[PDB]
Each structure stands twice: as C-alpha cells, then as structure tokens.
C-alpha cells in the first residue's frame, strides 16, 4: 500500500523492517517499536514522546508530541510516505 520516503525507511529498518512497501498498520507497528526500544516516551505520562535530537524529530518536525493527537500523527506520517 505505502512506500516510506528514505528517512522514514531508515527508521523502520533500524527495528528490523526490511521491505519497501508496507501497510499503514505495519508502519505504525514499527514506529511504536522504534519509540519503545529507544525509550523516547515519558516514563510517568506515557503518551508523551520526546523526539528532539532523535531522527524522529527530524521526520516529524516537532520536538515532542502526544500519542493522543491521532490526526496530527497520521498527517506527519503521511508527509513521509508516497
């Protein structure tokens, strides 16, 4: 379905993803694993994700975000897809 642009593809490959084309659900799976494994989420309010100085901040263009902002996260992702 979707083809990540190169920076997002690099993030997905760092957690094991090997393909060029993914479903959105698989992009989301790998991105959650990226966040989890790099400990980017706040340990007390775990919907807060810190990304400034990680590749993810560059991708999204924000220094932090909340997981609860669903429409914003979809939008940011799709700016990194073709």
């Amino acid at each position: 379905l979707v083809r990540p642009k190169p920076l997002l593809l690099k993030l997905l490959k760092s957690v094991g993803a090997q393909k060029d084309t993914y479903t959105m659900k698989e992009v989301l799976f790998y991105l959650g694993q990226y966040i989890m494994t790099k400990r980017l989420y706040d340990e007390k309010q775990q919907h807060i994700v810190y990304c400034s100085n990680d590749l993810l901040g560059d991708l999204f263009g924000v220094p932090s975000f909340s997981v609860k902002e669903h429409r914003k996260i979809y939008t940011m992702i799709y700016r990194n897809l073709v």
Binding site: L28, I35, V67, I73
Partner: peptide, 12 residues
C-alpha cells in the same frame, strides 16, 4: 495507560 496501550488507541 502505558505507551503501547496509547499507541494501540492510535492504531485501532
């Protein structure tokens, strides 16, 4: 909720 529980909410 935990991170992955919020992320599930995002995915569903």
């Amino acid at each position: 909720l935990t991170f992955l529980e919020y992320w599930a909410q995002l995915m569903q």
